[PDB]
Amino acid sequence: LEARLAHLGVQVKGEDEEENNLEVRETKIKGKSGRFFTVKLPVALDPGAKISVIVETVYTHVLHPYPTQITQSEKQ
């Protein structure tokens, strides 16, 4: 699905959605295939802490008609 990824957005789970959007940069991690993204947290996460984040992705062309051909009456 990496080729078909139209957009990626990350925001922290909080009331301040407008300000909770996180900066994301495309990154390549050595030795591992596939696209990766580096997300900068608003505050550093110290040992033993947790945070909740929401990741949204949109893919294009991932739905393929089957059967390929239909008549006027036939459904999709």
Residues lying near another protein in the complex (CB under 8 A) are found at 66-69
Reading phi first (left if > 0) and then psi (alpha if -120 to 50, else beta), residue 48 is in: left
Q: Which is nearer to another protein, 33 or 68 (CB)?
A: 68
Q: Which is nearer to another protein, 69 or 73 (CB)?
A: 69
DSSP SS3 for 29: coil
Min dist CB 63 to another protein, Å, is 16
Min dist CB 59 to another protein, Å, is 24
Phi and psi angles of residue 17, each rounded to the nearest 5 degrees, phi first? -60, -35
